[PDB]
Ligand binder design. Structure first.
Ligand code: HEM
Length: 153
């Protein structure tokens, strides 16, 4: 459980993300792919991609950064009451994309990195701890759903 004040810190910095969803999504995926190249293997079309400018010019990759942040933003705005939003996400990522929980840890790290880089004034220790708690809860719940679907994380 997060406190109401913790959720408000989460949603405060998320409003900043929403001013430029696509640019934040780009930075988060590029950070993910740099820090953890193996994850890039999960995206058929930019498997070949090599440079940051290639990732930044890529139309696909920008659309997926938006897809991620749109879904996650709706989950965060549910303040933990996200079972209905996690059901389809767990379904696809456990049975079709096969995304282990450690890759969700990786992307949570990249999200926190980008939010700190871009909004330090809105992402001090209080707010970083809140966001970390919120992404931890997301990963915990989706992991339980993975197991329900027969996928061991
Ligand atoms: C906060 C974490 C994430 C969220 C909210 C998220 C959300 C989404 C959504 C909404 C879609 C499109 C609908 C669907 O297929 O379910 C999608 C597709 C996809 N996701 Fe995720 N995702 C996350 C993490 C990841 C990670 C860490 C990876 C790989 C390392 C990944 C790989 C994929 C792939 C390969 C697709 C299909 C892309 C395509 O075929 O165009 N996702 N994701």
């Amino acid at each position: 459980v997060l406190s109401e004040g913790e959720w408000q810190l989460v949603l405060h910095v998320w409003a900043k993300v929403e001013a430029d969803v696509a640019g934040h999504g780009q930075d988060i995926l590029i950070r993910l792919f740099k820090s953890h190249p193996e994850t890039l293997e999960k995206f058929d079309r930019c498997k070949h991609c090599k440079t940051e400018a290639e990732m930044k010019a890529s139309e696909d990759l920008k659309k997926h950064g938006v897809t991620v942040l749109t879904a996650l933003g709706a989950i965060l705005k549910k303040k933990g009451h996200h079972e209905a939003e996690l059901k389809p996400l767990a379904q696809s990522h456990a049975t079709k994309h096969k995304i282990p929980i450690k890759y969700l840890e990786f992307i949570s790290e990249a999200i926190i990195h980008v939010l700190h880089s871009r909004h330090p004034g809105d992402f001090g220790a209080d707010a970083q701890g809140a966001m970390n708690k919120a992404l931890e809860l997301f990963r915990k719940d989706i992991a339980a759903k993975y197991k329900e679907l027969g996928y061991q994380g």
